[PDB]
Design a protein around this ligand. Sequence first.
Ligand SMILES: Nc1ncnc2c1ncn2[C@@H]1O[C@H](COP(=O)(O)OP(=O)(O)OC[C@H]2O[C@H](O)[C@H](O)[C@@H]2O)[C@@H](O)[C@H]1O
Ligand SMILES: NC(=O)[C@H]1CCCc2c1[nH]c1ccc(Cl)cc21
Ligand SMILES: [Zn+2]
Length: 273
Amino acid sequence: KLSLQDVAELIRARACQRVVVMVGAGISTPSGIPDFRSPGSGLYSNLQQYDLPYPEAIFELPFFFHNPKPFFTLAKELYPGNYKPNVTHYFLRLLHDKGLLLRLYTQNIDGLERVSGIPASKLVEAHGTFASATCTVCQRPFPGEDIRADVMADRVPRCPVCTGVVKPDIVFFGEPLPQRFLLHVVDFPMADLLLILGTSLEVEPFASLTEAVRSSVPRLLINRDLVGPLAWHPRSRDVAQLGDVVHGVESLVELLGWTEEMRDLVQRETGKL
Ligand SMILES: Nc1ncnc2c1ncn2[C@@H]1O[C@H](COP(=O)(O)OP(=O)(O)OC[C@H]2O[C@H](O)[C@H](O)[C@@H]2O)[C@@H](O)[C@H]1O
Ligand SMILES: NC(=O)[C@H]1CCCc2c1[nH]c1ccc(Cl)cc21
Ligand SMILES: [Zn+2]
């Protein structure tokens, strides 16, 4: 059984040099964005004011087509621009500056990976992005910034060509994943370390990606709980660092001897922000 120290030593040695990283909503709870499924604070448990047929409806296309207002009220609360990356996002950024990041796959739409300074070429926004938007009727694309003012002013954005409702290019639940996600079949066989942070690993095909790396590759989970294939299909090189994601990342960072360089980077990026 590998320890968190063994993993850090592998990384220090550059024995793991092509790190694939998978993240979900749990990496942004420290930034003030709720996840979905946490008791008490998760988005699922706080949607009564929207009077939905069931919680998941607010992120579903058929419901959106019936009544887009609940989605847009929520999106205004979640819209990028003032939330900041936290230590989790900066740790990933530091992996990238150290040339260790092969690819970062995120289920999040908050854009915080890009903000923390990871290049677009290193990211797969598997659930899309507010950076672009599409008419749901005529399919006309728009710059995501085109709908910002309406969303902030509590207006549903409308297509100036056909008047159809414009939606950010977010992947609503059970909608087709973006063409960029097709890189998973190139990246996962090349990974020599898989790091999984802040995701329940409930939602497919994303969760089965943990199984797509080589059996010899360590899979390090940094999360509140042991989840998904790491609970139900453990492999002998799995490591679990269970607890708050920021403390878990800081523990790894210290074992890496990167504490000072992180402190340095976070201070620098905060200033730029
Ligand atoms: N501060 C924290 N520290 C450690 N773990 C945390 C923290 N906060 C949350 N967690 C864990 O973080 C995990 C968050 O799990 P989920 O809420 O399902 O979010 P997702 O991103 O995996 O999947 C949501 C996909 O499902 C929807 O369809 C959308 O498409 C989403 O993209 C839980 O294990 C929490 O214990
Ligand atoms: N932090 C996040 O970006 C998370 C939590 C905020 C809402 C959200 C996230 N992921 C999503 C993926 C699809 C859709 Cl429709 C919504 C979300
Ligand atoms: Zn249109």
